Amino acid sequence: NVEKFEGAELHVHVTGSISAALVPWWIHWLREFQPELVVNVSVTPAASRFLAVRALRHLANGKVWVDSWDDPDVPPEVNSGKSGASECFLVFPATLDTVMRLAQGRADSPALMMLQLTDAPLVIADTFPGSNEIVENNVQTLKLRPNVEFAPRVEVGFNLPGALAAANRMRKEGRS
Amino acid sequence: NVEKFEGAELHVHVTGSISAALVPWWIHWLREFQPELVVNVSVTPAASRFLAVRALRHLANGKVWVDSWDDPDVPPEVNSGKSGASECFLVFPATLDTVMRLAQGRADSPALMMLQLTDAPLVIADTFPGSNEIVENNVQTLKLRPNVEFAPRVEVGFNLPGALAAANRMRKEGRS
Amino acid sequence: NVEKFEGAELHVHVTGSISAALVPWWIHWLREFQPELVVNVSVTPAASRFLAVRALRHLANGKVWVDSWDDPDVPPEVNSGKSGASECFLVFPATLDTVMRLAQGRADSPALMMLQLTDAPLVIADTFPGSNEIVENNVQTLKLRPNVEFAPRVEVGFNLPGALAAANRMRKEGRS
Amino acid sequence: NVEKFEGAELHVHVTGSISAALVPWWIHWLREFQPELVVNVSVTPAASRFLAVRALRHLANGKVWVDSWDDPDVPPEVNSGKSGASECFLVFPATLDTVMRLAQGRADSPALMMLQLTDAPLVIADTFPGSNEIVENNVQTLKLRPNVEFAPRVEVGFNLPGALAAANRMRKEGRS
Amino acid sequence: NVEKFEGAELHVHVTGSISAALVPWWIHWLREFQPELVVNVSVTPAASRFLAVRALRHLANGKVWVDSWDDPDVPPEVNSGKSGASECFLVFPATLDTVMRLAQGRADSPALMMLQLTDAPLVIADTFPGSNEIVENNVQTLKLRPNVEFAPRVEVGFNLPGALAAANRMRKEGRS
Amino acid sequence: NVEKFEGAELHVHVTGSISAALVPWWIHWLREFQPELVVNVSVTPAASRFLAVRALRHLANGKVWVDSWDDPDVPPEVNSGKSGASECFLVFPATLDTVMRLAQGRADSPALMMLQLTDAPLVIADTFPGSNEIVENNVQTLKLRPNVEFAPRVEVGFNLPGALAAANRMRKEGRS
Numbered sequence A, B, C, D, E, F: 001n002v003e004k005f006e007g008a009e010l011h012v013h014v015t016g017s018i019s020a021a022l023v024p025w026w027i028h029w030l031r032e033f034q035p036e037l038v039v040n041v042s043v044t045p046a047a048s049r050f051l052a053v054r055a056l057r058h059l060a061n062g063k064v065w066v067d068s069w070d071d072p073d074v075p076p077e078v079n080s081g082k083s084g085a086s087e088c089f090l091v092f093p094a095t096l097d098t099v100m101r102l103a104q105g106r107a108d109s110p111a112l113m114m115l116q117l118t119d120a121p122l123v124i125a126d127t128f129p130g131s132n133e134i135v136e137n138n139v140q141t142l143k144l145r146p147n148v149e150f151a152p153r154v155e156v157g158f159n160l161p162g163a164l165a166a167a168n169r170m171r172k173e174g175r176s
């Protein structure tokens, strides 16, 4: 049930769960599955303790940068909600904290400024250890944004093929 | 009116108010008052400017760690809302900022992940310099969590004996 | 339509937008326009990448400090919502993130503790790259505080003369 | 055609090719495929530029160490050709240089001392960019050691399932 | 049986026993018990591993300095046996080593120069792990100095109320 | 009386007076006043204590570099008296020391090599604290160079509009 992303370029935002260690394998998979796709990647300091940014610079064909206002590779168009010509944004994986920061309008990292300002489909491949009533409320708050969805389950949302299908879906709804 | 904590182990989370300087005296008090109790302690970077973690490693009989995702002493069970076999969690003292972060579902430190995920009684010995309408709303938000209480007053909540009584109370309510 | 601030001392809190590079010119302007005024200045780490704190120590006649709990110049009265004898507080410029932190009751910097605790007129000279529904909600939340206003427009609020007029206005309303 | 390793514990030695970025995914796979297996892992400085040792400490249930005589995690039994109770050794992936060093009797890293001294099945999942006559001669030299094999092809030998089958094969030949 | 110190200012010299962790609580106690008293504090490098000098700068109303010839806060009057206008000197707590250094006329720290040169009452709140014949001889040697006493017991001398009573006693004997 | 610079590109050399703090405002002004103009900027180490080079990289559309032989951004054409295709050179502001170094043929910074070798109009927006007979002689020495002028006064020469008019003037004299 695995389908191709119908756009030309997407952006992957990688956050600090142990699943980030598995992302270079999935980026490699997506590059072989769809060689014409341009894949940009942002990586949080936390995630950079679980993978090597250097390896992504090799596996990914788009821009690769650490999600930090002091990193010189951070492209200027983050301040307009863009990543090159990315047509969707996948948070893969997405920590509890990254989702709380998104739900709260925070722009304390250039990737979060970018995710606050984008109108493009934004898919969240959540990897939460757990939840409570206050977390669930902050997740509900994200329905105020029409472009945001959580990826299809596999109880956890670490699901790139599902994220790609959800993205192609929200892309075609944005045209008709 | 001072009573013993009826569990076997608790956890003390120390945050960056000048009252943190007084916590080693209170930990020493609790160790003499109740020698069979296992006391775990987490200390925020801020609080570590007002006390010495080394002194707690001596005064406390449980695990002691700095509240930072890079500290190697951070136990893995924080990601399941546990601290060893702690049966309650005392934030002693609790800054305004720690309480805002808790009220907002933040997990940007392993102690906050832990406090988000625990079902055990969570008592907050607040030391706020002051308040406003937005702070009061964020404090109200904590009533969505049944396990959270503020410690009995002494206008400030820097009250370990009261916290222990409140904890034994919420522990027995959780059994009947 | 440019009028003088009718108080004796104010405080300028400078945050990390490229407009911070232009603040020393405006501080110099305010010092020549109103030589009797004492101007205190706080500068966020981010803003300190776009201007030099040293230059403000020369151009400003009040206290100048980096907005960090470890800076030794941070005056103790931030923990009572004061900056010397400042009678208003201008966030000039104000990032999206600084405004979200204010709207959320955060005290994770001494300037934010100060801005949470003050009753004085607080004017926000916002420089947002953009917005969404969740940001707009967090901006609405600031109406729970009677002393907070956004400066008059020039779509952006980087407007010191307007901020000064708004401040004198909220000052006289607080007396009658 | 994927079969389980018939021993209790093995050792994975990871070397500096971009394929090392994909090893945490394969370690995760082997841990789920065979939960009773103890997996030890050594990682060369070079490979540590393409993956995070920290992530392996989480994904692997055995000892994890950097292949350096100064790393304090290096177990003493490397000087007897052992890694805990490992019953085979997989070089996954194996650089040209690691294979030249092995072919030349080098012990300039504790993993290479270990691989020189072991009698256990040693499988080499080579990832060479290319070859020449002198490289091919050094690869032939490894036939002087009865326990050494190259993994089954998939032109490249980055093949853990094949390596496991080859290992179970050389293990049973060593008993009969 | 707790009485007030009858002078205007005293000096507390804190040394490297785990009891130093408890001194900020006792300084806080003395400041509330006797708000008019000016309390100066010196802290040895060793003691600074068990408490935070920063916390004492907040809790103490007099000068606070690290006991080191390179610390810029060290007041010049240590070279005349003074600490501001301190009328007594409490070594609280006092290590075995600090007492040996005092007994031997050592001035290898500015606090020890100060304690060698003072004529004011000097009270020693010893916290020794143990003793031998040579230690006891060095303690006897301190009777050659009329101003030196050990604080009343509670086997250990970690006793600020007793030290204060002993100090008021030796102060009035020095006048009649 | 404010006129546009009639060339396509100019270079601004910023030196270590407190007026350097005001240059980003003036660069912003010149970019809005004349959007087609390419503005290159060099900044002395001293001036970099009074402004942020990073802010100029954003406000200026040409090359921006620190005036140091070790800065990698220093363009090679400084050794031919050029800055890209700059048609004039404004020292804005100009310290006493920068003007002495220029008057004395010094090339101890790449900007000074550049200013020694250029034939283009060179305008000096001096900010001297004061003068003496030897300084005045060194300023007279600059009349040996036909391309050098001091900007029109406003007693001080911190005057970009005047500098631009003087530059267009010396440009047209160099053609007729």
Ligand SMILES: Cc1cc2nc3c(=O)[nH]c(=O)nc-3n(C[C@H](O)[C@H](O)[C@H](O)COP(=O)(O)OP(=O)(O)OC[C@H]3O[C@@H](n4cnc5c(N)ncnc54)[C@H](O)[C@@H]3O)c2cc1C
Pocket: A014, A015, A016, A017, A018, A019, A044, A045, A046, A047, A067, A094, A095, A096, A097, A098, A108, A109, A127, A128, A129, B069, B079, B107, B108, B109, B113, D058
């Ligand atoms: C082994 C392990 C597994 C984990 N698994 C999970 C998991 O499955 N799910 C999960 O939700 N969490 C997990 N965590 C916890 C997670 O790593 C933390 O919550 C972490 O803070 C997530 O950060 P991030 O990648 O979302 O963003 P980051 O950018 O790393 O966030 C760091 C924080 O610092 C702030 N910050 C901004 N600028 C700076 C700066 N200049 N310097 C410092 N801080 C700055 C950010 O605003 C943010 O609050 C795990 C942790 C460990 C150790």
Ligand SMILES: Cc1cc2nc3c(=O)[nH]c(=O)nc-3n(C[C@H](O)[C@H](O)[C@H](O)COP(=O)(O)OP(=O)(O)OC[C@H]3O[C@@H](n4cnc5c(N)ncnc54)[C@H](O)[C@@H]3O)c2cc1C
Pocket: B014, B015, B016, B017, B018, B019, B044, B045, B046, B047, B067, B094, B095, B096, B097, B098, B108, B109, B127, B128, B129, C069, C079, C107, C108, C109, C113, E058
């Ligand atoms: C003398 C004094 C007395 C004070 N008294 C009080 C008081 O009584 N009550 C009160 O409420 N406040 C008080 N404060 C202010 C208080 O210290 C600050 O609000 C402080 O930020 C509290 O931090 P914390 O201990 O709650 O948590 P911390 O963990 O110290 O929080 C630090 C912040 O950094 C973020 N962060 C996460 N990861 C990182 C990282 N890797 N690097 C950097 N930052 C990171 C955290 O999310 C958080 O926002 C006082 C301050 C001083 C100087």
Ligand SMILES: Cc1cc2nc3c(=O)[nH]c(=O)nc-3n(C[C@H](O)[C@H](O)[C@H](O)COP(=O)(O)OP(=O)(O)OC[C@H]3O[C@@H](n4cnc5c(N)ncnc54)[C@H](O)[C@@H]3O)c2cc1C
Pocket: A069, A079, A107, A108, A109, A113, C014, C015, C016, C017, C018, C019, C044, C045, C046, C047, C067, C094, C095, C096, C097, C098, C108, C109, C127, C128, C129, F058
């Ligand atoms: C060229 C450029 C232009 C920009 N223009 C704009 C603009 O116009 N508008 C806009 O809204 N944004 C803009 N930004 C983005 C802005 O700089 C960031 O959002 C930045 O985080 C703003 O920080 P601040 O000055 O508000 O506060 P800061 O104090 O700098 O906030 C830093 C973050 O770190 C946390 N923190 C607290 N203590 C510590 C500690 N000890 N160590 C580390 N972190 C800590 C704070 O809580 C906060 O979340 C721009 C960025 C760039 C590069």
Ligand SMILES: Cc1cc2nc3c(=O)[nH]c(=O)nc-3n(C[C@H](O)[C@H](O)[C@H](O)COP(=O)(O)OP(=O)(O)OC[C@H]3O[C@@H](n4cnc5c(N)ncnc54)[C@H](O)[C@@H]3O)c2cc1C
Pocket: A058, D014, D015, D016, D017, D018, D019, D044, D045, D046, D047, D067, D094, D095, D096, D097, D098, D108, D109, D127, D128, D129
């Ligand atoms: C993007 C990329 C992809 C690559 N892909 C491949 C590939 O597919 N196949 C391939 O064969 N190569 C590849 N290489 C090259 C490979 O990374 C180098 O050959 C590297 O030296 C391999 O080292 P190692 O991991 O085998 O062992 P290392 O232990 O990293 O070897 C480092 C060298 O230093 C010596 N040494 C020992 N002790 C020390 C010490 N204390 N300090 C310093 N040096 C010491 C070792 O003996 C050895 O000679 C690639 C390189 C890059 C950048």
Ligand SMILES: Cc1cc2nc3c(=O)[nH]c(=O)nc-3n(C[C@H](O)[C@H](O)[C@H](O)COP(=O)(O)OP(=O)(O)OC[C@H]3O[C@@H](n4cnc5c(N)ncnc54)[C@H](O)[C@@H]3O)c2cc1C
Pocket: B058, E014, E015, E016, E017, E018, E019, E044, E045, E046, E047, E067, E094, E095, E096, E097, E098, E108, E109, E127, E128, E129
């Ligand atoms: C957990 C723990 C508990 C302890 N409890 C006790 C206790 O209860 N009682 C007890 O007596 N001891 C105790 N000790 C031991 C005590 O900490 C040491 O004896 C320590 O040396 C005491 O130093 P001080 O604070 O007296 O003075 P310090 O000033 O710390 O003495 C350090 C030594 O270095 C010398 N020195 C001078 N200048 C310098 C310099 N620039 N650099 C380096 N050294 C210099 C000093 O002359 C002195 O000899 C304990 C130690 C630990 C770890």
Ligand SMILES: Cc1cc2nc3c(=O)[nH]c(=O)nc-3n(C[C@H](O)[C@H](O)[C@H](O)COP(=O)(O)OP(=O)(O)OC[C@H]3O[C@@H](n4cnc5c(N)ncnc54)[C@H](O)[C@@H]3O)c2cc1C
Pocket: C058, F014, F015, F016, F017, F018, F019, F044, F045, F046, F047, F067, F094, F095, F096, F097, F098, F108, F109, F127, F128, F129
């Ligand atoms: C608050 C303040 C205001 C001031 N206002 C004025 C003012 O209005 N007018 C005024 O004329 N002066 C003023 N000054 C003084 C001025 O900053 C100094 O004269 C300063 O040296 C000027 O340097 P520059 O920017 O001209 O060049 P710089 O390049 O900073 O000159 C530094 C010196 O170091 C030499 N040098 C070369 N290479 C190196 C190297 N690698 N490392 C170190 N040094 C090297 C240079 O040749 C030169 O002599 C002020 C100073 C302060 C603190």
